[PDB]
Design a protein around this ligand. Structure first.
Ligand SMILES: Cc1cc2nc3c(=O)[nH]c(=O)nc-3n(C[C@H](O)[C@H](O)[C@H](O)COP(=O)(O)O)c2cc1C
Ligand SMILES: Cc1cc2nc3c(=O)[nH]c(=O)nc-3n(C[C@H](O)[C@H](O)[C@H](O)COP(=O)(O)O)c2cc1C
Lengths: 304, 304
């Protein structure tokens, strides 16, 4: 039995990693993720320069998940590039860098600088399109600019879509770009609103309390997007993100088509130790079913 | 203390009703909803002719809600018109009729026939725009077609939106039609997917297991849409629909700005007695807080 995943020219010890933005902003956080049993790790979505982030409170723990309006707090692209350049131990695990510039041009500039580092160190780009991916002509324009600026393959982080026409429309643009080697589904379900009964107030300060939803709320939506893009993008990898708490949630993600599985809200709560539990629980499900490798049921969700 | 709602020229004993589609397809179900302590009720969304719907199973109970792809099974417009005209006891509570024709014309034709029944009996139309409302010119077209065809005010059932550009776009269109007197937020979060761990297969037969999500999954999305339209459409009523299982849930919908509160998945699981529990629970929250009427906190959600 193995949880290994052989993709992007790398051997990942297991399918698990953090979700971009969770436990990956500071130098100490990246080291904790490297030290952990996760198969990989991704940096916090960075901007060309340092950003303080939205006003606190900007994250709130719900019984069924989370709601947040962080506003891309990050130490700046320079910092994560340098972490990628000469601070990360590639001997432990492969590394993903999330970039999220406010324009096609900002991104393109970061990629031009990332390229030598990626070519030498092997760090992998995940472009956060989550908003751009909700405008299919903006999306094509981003992707064309990046593919012109960036010689290496990369991935894209997508917002959830909620109908087959959008799935088709997005997949069609993605399939025109060979360099996009993976698609991560999903970013938060956007602009939910949480209110406290006692205080009768929203629970986060920015955007009049409207924020991104994660956790148990988003699990069926994440599965749907993973499977929808798995079907429509046979030439790409799909990374699952959303609603993962147990090895069984992981199993379902993989069943729907996920190659890698990102953990957000659960990791935020349980900490880097969760990955040791997640691998054991996944191995458990597989043992109960006689599975020896993820390649044996990835994307093999059945009709009834 | 009172839960009365005075809207649309009617007095409602309380803000609770069923969601369209739940416990409202047969005479028996409609009788049960009328006999219940609900403030109102609404018929199954109907088509000009009877529909048998999608193949079974097309509904499945989730840990935190439901998934379904019913496919609009309904007894046909003639049936619900007859119920509205001849069978419903209006001295018991007001009645809503849901229509969901497949084209603008189908909807226009039904509205032409509903119009005299609405004038004499007082049944109130909810037009199901949920995908049509995800296309703003098609929405504009429908609304204009219906406003031409139908002399009375009506409401519209909306799908969820997930960003402020869409809230602004929809609001702008809705506010251009004075006959649109209420807006129901929300229909199902579209096209989620759930997979059983044991069978490794989807849990509903249609559309490869993709279906609309209901219940606790949709609640923060529901509140967000209720409040977003409450703010942008001050001339209209907002009806809340999504994730109501308790009186506190209803309290939050009202705090977000809901005038009526619709109950779907929870009603499906519990049955019509749920309305006496929901009223008692909502009265309990108001009592702890010293509220005597819903107007004292409707739409009064606080920012930080
Ligand atoms: C506090 C917080 C910060 C996040 N920051 C980012 C980010 O910088 N870039 C990004 O693509 N997603 C970000 N996300 C979204 C996650 O990467 C992921 O898409 C989502 O949380 C999946 O939900 P899950 O918590 O159920 O795993 C953030 C989420 C949270 C809760
Ligand atoms: C089995 C089922 C049938 C439904 N049928 C309709 C329908 O015919 N028309 C409609 O507008 N919404 C329909 N809905 C959606 C509900 O009206 C409601 O929008 C949704 O379930 C969210 O509310 P909830 O969380 O309380 O279930 C249906 C939902 C379910 C679960």
């Amino acid at each position: 039995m193995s949880l290994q995943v052989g993709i992007l020219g790398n051997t990942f010890a297991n399918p698990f990693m953090n979700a971009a933005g969770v436990m990956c902003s500071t130098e100490e956080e990246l080291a904790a993720m490297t030290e952990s049993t996760s198969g990989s790790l991704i940096t916090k979505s960075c901007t060309p320069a340092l950003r303080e982030g939205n006003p606190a409170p900007r994250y709130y723990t719900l019984p069924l998940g989370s709601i947040n309006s962080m506003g891309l707090p990050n130490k700046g692209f320079d910092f994560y590039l340098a972490y990628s350049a000469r601070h990360h131990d590639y001997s432990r695990k492969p590394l993903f860098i999330s970039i999220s510039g406010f324009s096609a041009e900002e991104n393109a500039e970061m990629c031009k600088r990332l390229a030598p580092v990626a070519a030498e160190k092997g760090v992998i780009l995940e472009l956060n399109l989550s908003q751009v991916a909700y405008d299919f002509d903006a999306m094509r324009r981003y992707l064309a600019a990046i593919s012109e600026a960036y010689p290496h393959p990369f991935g894209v982080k997508m917002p959830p879509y909620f109908d087959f026409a959008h799935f088709d429309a997005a997949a069609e643009i993605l399939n025109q770009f060979p360099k996009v080697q993976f698609i991560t589904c999903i970013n938060s379900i956007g602009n939910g609103l949480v209110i406290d009964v006692e205080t009768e107030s929203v629970v986060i300060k920015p955007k009049q309390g409207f924020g991104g939803l994660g956790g148990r709320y988003v699990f069926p939506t994440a599965l749907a997007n993973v499977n929808a893009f798995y079907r429509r993008c046979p030439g790409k990898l799909i990374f699952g993100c959303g609603g993962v708490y147990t090895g069984e949630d992981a199993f379902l993600h993989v069943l729907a088509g996920a190659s890698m599985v990102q953990v957000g809200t659960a990791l935020h709560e349980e900490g880097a130790a969760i990955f040791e539990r997640l691998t054991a629980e996944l191995l458990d499900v597989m043992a109960k079913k006689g599975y020896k490798a993820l390649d044996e049921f990835r994307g093999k969700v059945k009709a009834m």
